[PDB]
Amino acid sequence: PPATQISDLSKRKPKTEDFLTFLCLRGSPAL
Amino acid sequence: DKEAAFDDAVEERVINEEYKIWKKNTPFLYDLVMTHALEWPSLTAQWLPDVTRPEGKDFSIHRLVLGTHTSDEQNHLVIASVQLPNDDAQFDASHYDEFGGFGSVSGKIEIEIKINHEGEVNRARYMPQNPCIIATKTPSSDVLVFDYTKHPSKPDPSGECNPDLRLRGHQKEGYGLSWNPNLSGHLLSASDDHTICLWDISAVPKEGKVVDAKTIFTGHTAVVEDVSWHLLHESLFGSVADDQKLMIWDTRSNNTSKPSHSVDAHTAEVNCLSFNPYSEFILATGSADKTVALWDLRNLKLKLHSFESHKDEIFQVQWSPHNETILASSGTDRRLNVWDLSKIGEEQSPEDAEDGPPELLFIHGGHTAKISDFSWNPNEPWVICSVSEDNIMQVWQMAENIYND
Amino acid sequence: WKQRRIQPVHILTSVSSLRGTRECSVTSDLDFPTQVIPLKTLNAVASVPIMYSWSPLQ
Amino acid sequence: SLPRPHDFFDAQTLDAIRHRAICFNLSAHIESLGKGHSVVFHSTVIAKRKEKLLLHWMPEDILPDVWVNESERHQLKTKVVHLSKLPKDTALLLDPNIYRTMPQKRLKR
Amino acid sequence: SVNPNCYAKVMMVNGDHRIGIFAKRAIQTGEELFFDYRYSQAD
Amino acid sequence: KCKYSFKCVNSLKEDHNQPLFGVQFNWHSKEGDPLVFATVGSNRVTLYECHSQGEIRLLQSYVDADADENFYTCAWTYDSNTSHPLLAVAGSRGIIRIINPITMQCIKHYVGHGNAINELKFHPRDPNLLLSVSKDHALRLWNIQTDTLVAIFGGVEGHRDEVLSADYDLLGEKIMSCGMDHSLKLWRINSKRMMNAIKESYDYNPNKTNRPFISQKIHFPDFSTRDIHRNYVDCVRWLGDLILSKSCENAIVCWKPGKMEDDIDKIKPSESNVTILGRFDYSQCDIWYMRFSMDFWQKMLALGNQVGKLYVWDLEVEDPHKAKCTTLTHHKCGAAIRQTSFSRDSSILIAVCDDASIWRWDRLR
Amino acid sequence: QADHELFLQAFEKPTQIYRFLRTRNLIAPIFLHRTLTYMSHRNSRTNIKRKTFKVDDMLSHLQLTTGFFHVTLEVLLVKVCHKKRKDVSCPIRQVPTGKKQVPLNPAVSSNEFEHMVKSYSLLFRVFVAQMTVFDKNRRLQLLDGEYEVAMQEMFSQGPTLQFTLRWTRIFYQFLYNNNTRQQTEARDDLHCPWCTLNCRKLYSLLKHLKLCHSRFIFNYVYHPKGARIDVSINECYDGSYAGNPQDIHRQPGFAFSRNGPVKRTPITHILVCRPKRTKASMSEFLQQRTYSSGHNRLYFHSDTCLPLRPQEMEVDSEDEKDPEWLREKTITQIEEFSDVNEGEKEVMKLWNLHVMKHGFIADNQMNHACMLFVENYGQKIIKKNLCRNFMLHLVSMHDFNLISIMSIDKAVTKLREMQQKLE
């Protein structure tokens, strides 16, 4: 349950050094 | 440049995906979804007022004037037969397939008269007083006037059929054309040679192979992309060109160079022009500045609720004769933006403002290429027919659910 | 063959990730550094159902 | 049954879309701090008012730079604006993948 | 298909047998046709 | 024993790591221009350029993995109007893609094959004629210059099964086509109809006329045989005026049409007794769909082996096939070579395995 | 891990493609979601046309200044405009100023401005300086107050020119062929995670997702606390090219290039006949049978896999009573006889080829068939000098009936003219 859906799913189109850190920089695509 | 071609390919596939998405919201946005692809590519649309609904055939006899936009293969002029579901649409009725509510088999889009043409067909404005005479605009200096009844059907393997009425008054390619609903005849045509041409027509002489321009309106420095009459009053009309002036020209004013109305109404190119019969004052105009704005005839210096919702040049605007507070506009943005004034100068919920201007009501997004013409149905209230350059002719009616009480 | 020359094919190594896409990994087996080249993907075309040749007849 | 004819979209433009999205996210982080529905930006004190301030934002013609009071700037240095409320004049210049006429090079008129 | 729009009937023409294809119903223009394979040896 | 001696320089790998079938050197490159070649694999074709002093490098790599495509041939050619090298690739689906490595953009795509294209070859007199031995029990001759199907070889008595590969003569006078029907029929291009059709296609335009291109279907070949190879034949060539066809019989038999004295050019179409002269024999090369190639001067003929060994044949000497020639072995050769290619000058040759891992050799000279 | 990593990538790729498509939808939607009659939850504004259109009218000085902190300088104007149709990029006009001998590390505003120009901005050069004088939303910027306007390299510690500036519980389950669900919550009330859409309640989201995101298939299942919605890419997804089919197989550089007019076959389509305009039903959340007429496809040529252009629809029958290979086989079979004469072989080939190429089946016309030989081949029989063979063959039919003595006489006399014409 990663709270907001955007912060864990929309980090796939910018899947390189544009995630602006946050949970996207962490293991968001994986478990 | 490689980048330009790459971007063009990306935007082409984006437009395709957008159209595919828009297909799915057909039952929940409209009432009828009819779209027929002309064999010779579609470039113009219209609505002849002929109607006939015989007993046992609830469909009304509907005819629309299509166009011809291929390179050169025996250029033609197509008149197709269409149908309307009428009140007894028979959605399913355990007999949907022709359907029990309208023609759903055999002559759904059957062709009636296909006269050969010499060149291209730009406009398909017919005389409303006598729906037999139908005009056509060609890249040459002359316009073509045909007669689907006098001319035989089943064209021979040849082209350039004599229309018996060739109005040659222009010099360069023509792109505008309009008739006079009040007075039979008076076909006004605006061309790319910075001028708008008038042909009296009406009492055409017998064997009139050559017809000269009765009047010429050359007052706009740039090319006039459309000229339209005032629906309520036939003694005046409007012209507009790239010079950013949605002018209104009064006939029989003894001045063919200075328009009666000199309102700029924009800053960039402006192409479209129309009026409304019921709304005797509300008008509309398309432009490059994407700022299609309603105007009042008595007070035109001030600006009404400028429907700043377009995204590029707009080539066609019209307002619904059936209602009063409804207008429409289509252009290069492949969107037929339908206007509404009853919500102008009023507020709403934040989500309503997020959707867009409260005044703007409808926009039709079922096109892949630039829209070249569109028209309402004189008989049915909500039925709209719009065409584009992708060779697709559509007949559709906007849903009546929203305008209840 | 010796009548006419040919335009000098420099075979330049394209660009360095012009579109910011995946790049090639040419891991030379011999002692050489791996070369990187963006994968210049080419457009696809519509296929056609399979069939064989047939003899026309009436 | 007959399979899907051909995926006309994403044949070649998928990577271009990813590149454009990467550029957008790196420039604005609208998907991170803009709440997905608004433009996120970072401001700096380019100018000031002798006594207000000018918390100018880096993206030109994307997030307009505004003028705010000294305490107002020091508190709300960063302003987040909805894309719906974004100006229509510079929205086209913000990104070329939102609307550009494909066949307008020739014919058209 | 189980509901073909066409059927086959062989007719002896001039001392020779030639298969003729016949439509089962009023077929409108331009559709994909059918024929019941169960009539033939290969069903 | 031969007067040739090659030495390896350097190698490389590929991103896709897939079998590589179509490989040739750029024999059209003249002096001064560094030597280049091409290799295929999966949906990602890869080029390379390996310099002297035992060094290798890569220059381009084009991927076409949008669909489940696959590459089979990498026939080399050039465009006269632009004087730029061209590389035509086809297979799997059966689309002939003409890559232009200089601009790194696709040029032409060709559709019409009933199955996967297996081989490709070019006309020595005209670089715009590419022979596609399609798998739809036929062979096709395309005219890249005008984008038309010049001739459809096959019909009532032609290509009972899929045609694998077809070669050209020393001057391209006659065409032979090995196939999967044990057939080695020589579809001659010596008739006047073929020349007339070639001229027509030279001065033909699909836009100009409404009717399609009137192709010529050669149902009956000018010569045929079914007894030279007991199994299907996959490779064919023209050793001088004789035949250098190859099958799964691990031998490229050098036979001649007709009797021992009759001229090949005047052989009657009803001849049914050909004569065999000799065959180059090796071992452990029984797999199918492999291609061999000689040099420009025909003195060095080479064929790949699935074990990894390489052979070069000396044919400039007198007499028919004899001696033992020389076998080339590489230090990093473990996979199956699908195509070998010398350079125009007898200096450089590169073998390619089933991992798109080119190993280039340089002759002592 | 190998299979696991490949599965993750092959799930991301369609999910990623839909993500970019939706962000484009997020960046610019196509149609107003309020006009959707089912989506009554959101945009529930007042619907009262009592405000008729007849009531339209009522209803609707700076004194700046020093030196750099760490030299003639000029101030220029940078203008951003609207990208018109004629010009791809926005035109920029520069209106610079003069230069003064300001001290090196020790002004009055002009009416250059004051609606084609989007905004007016001024930039200094001290040796460059970029500033945002006017906001893109016509907002106030570069207002009053002296400030050390820093100069960008190539207040702040960098070089500046001191100028006294003055006035003027919802659960989502992402799927792909029912592979593996996901667990993502919602941010705003019935907010669409792909594209920002604050649906007031599920009545603006349930069928909205299906009818606005065709790439996904949604199976609402409802939740005890909120609403549970599943997302999965539709397998069929007939989202191929929807224009002229003739551009699918065109050569690269011309396919889908929309360069100009292309001929096409007529087609008639209808898929929204008559909606019932009924009310919402829960069971709906828990057949199409589209109508088509005419030729709505691209056709192929019969001989090979080459596609058939619509211009090739005139006849293109590709049926022939006597194909070329049939004639060649007949000639070969005739000339391959082992017990026949040269003239006999020639005349037999001629008659067999005539019969195959004409397909005569009428018995009485068989008599007329004996005349047809004179109609076309007379010159060939004259040149080859095959009178005796033809006469013998013509005689050799009375044993099988057909013709008569009169027909034999007529044919012999008809050919006799040809030989006499040569004579």
From Swiss-Prot, chain A:
Top-level taxonomic group: Eukaryota
Region (Sufficient for interaction with the PRC2 complex): 3-31
Tissues/organs with expression: During embryogenesis, predominantly expressed in neurons and particularly in dorsal root ganglion cells.
Localisation per UniProt entry: Nucleus
Binding partners and assembly: Associates with the PRC2 complex, which consists of the core components EED, EZH1 or EZH2, SUZ12, and RBBP4, and various combinations of accessory subunits including AEBP2, JARID2, PHF19, MTF2 and EPOP. Found in a monomeric PRC2.2 (class 2) complex consisting of at least SUZ12, RBBP4, AEBP2 and JARID2. Facilitates nucleosome binding of the PRC2 complex. Interacts with SUZ12 (via C2H2-type zinc finger domain); the interaction is direct; competes with EPOP for SUZ12 binding. Interacts with histone methyltransferases EHMT1/GLP1 and EHMT2/G9a. Interacts with GATA4 (via the N-terminal region).
Domain remark in the UniProt entry: The ARID domain is required to target the PRC2 complex to its target genes.
Disease: Developmental delay with variable intellectual disability and dysmorphic facies: An autosomal dominant disorder characterized by various degrees of developmental delay, mild to moderate intellectual disability, learning difficulties, hypotonia, autistic features, behavior abnormalities, and dysmorphic facial features apparent from infancy or early childhood.
Protein's recorded name: Protein Jumonji
Organism of derivation: Homo sapiens
Whole-protein residues included: 139 to 169 of 1246
Swiss-Prot record, chain B:
PROSITE patterns reported for this sequence: WD_REPEATS_1, WD_REPEATS_2, WD_REPEATS_REGION
Keyword Ligase (UniProt): no
Localization annotation: Nucleus; Chromosome, Telomere
Keyword Repeat included in the entry's annotation: yes
Keywords per UniProt: Acetylation, Cell cycle, Chaperone, Chromatin regulator, Chromosome, DNA damage, DNA repair, DNA replication, Isopeptide bond, Nucleus, Phosphoprotein, Repeat, Repressor, Telomere, Transcription, Transcription regulation, Ubl conjugation, WD repeat
Chain positions covered by the region annotation Interaction with ARMC12: 1-126
GO cellular component term, pick one: cytosol
Domain of life, source organism: Eukaryota
Designated name of the protein: Histone-binding protein RBBP4
Annotated organism of origin: Homo sapiens (Human)
UniProtKB/Swiss-Prot annotation, chain E:
Regulation: induction: Expression is induced by E2F1, E2F2 and E2F3. Expression is reduced in cells subject to numerous types of stress including UV-, IR- and bleomycin-induced DNA damage and by activation of p53/TP53.
Domain of life from the UniProt record: Eukaryota
Localization of this protein: Nucleus
Tissue: In the ovary, expressed in primordial follicles and oocytes and also in external follicle cells (at protein level). Expressed in many tissues. Overexpressed in numerous tumor types including carcinomas of the breast, colon, larynx, lymphoma and testis.
Disease link: Weaver syndrome: A syndrome of accelerated growth and osseous maturation, unusual craniofacial appearance, hoarse and low-pitched cry, and hypertonia with camptodactyly. Distinguishing features of Weaver syndrome include broad forehead and face, ocular hypertelorism, prominent wide philtrum, micrognathia, deep horizontal chin groove, and deep-set nails. In addition, carpal bone development is advanced over the rest of the hand.
Protein family: Belongs to the class V-like SAM-binding methyltransferase superfamily. Histone-lysine methyltransferase family. EZ subfamily.
Official protein name in the record: Histone-lysine N-methyltransferase EZH2
Encoding gene (name): EZH2
Span within the parent record: 690 to 732 of 746
From Swiss-Prot, chain G:
Record annotation: effect of changing residue 344 to V: In IMMAS; decreased trimethylation of 'Lys-27' of histone H3; no effect on interaction with EZH2
Subunit structure: Component of the PRC2 complex, which consists of the core subunits EED, EZH1 or EZH2, SUZ12, and RBBP4, and various combinations of accessory subunits including AEBP2, JARID2, PHF19, MTF2 and EPOP. Within the complex, interacts (via C2H2 zinc finger domain) with JARID2 and EPOP; JARID2 and EPOP compete for SUZ12 binding. Also interacts with AEBP2 and PHF19. Forms a monomeric PRC2.2 (class 2) complex consisting of at least SUZ12, RBBP4, AEBP2 and JARID2.
Name of the protein in question: Polycomb protein SUZ12
Source organism of this protein record: Homo sapiens (Human)
Keyword Transcription: yes
Site (Breakpoint for translocation to form JAZF1-SUZ12 oncogene): residue numbering on this chain: 14-15
Note: Under hypoxic conditions, the precursor SUZ12 RNA undergoes regulated trans-splicing with the JAZF1 RNA, resulting in a chimeric isoform which may be protective against apoptosis. The chimeric transcript is characterized by JAZF1 exons 1-3 joined to SUZ12 exon 2-16. The chimeric transcript is expressed primarily in the endometrium from late secretory and early proliferative phases of the menstrual cycle, but not in normal myometrium at any phase of the cycle. Its expression is slightly induced by low levels of progesterone, but suppressed by both estrogen and high levels of progesterone.
Effect upon mutating residue 277 to Q: In IMMAS; uncertain significance
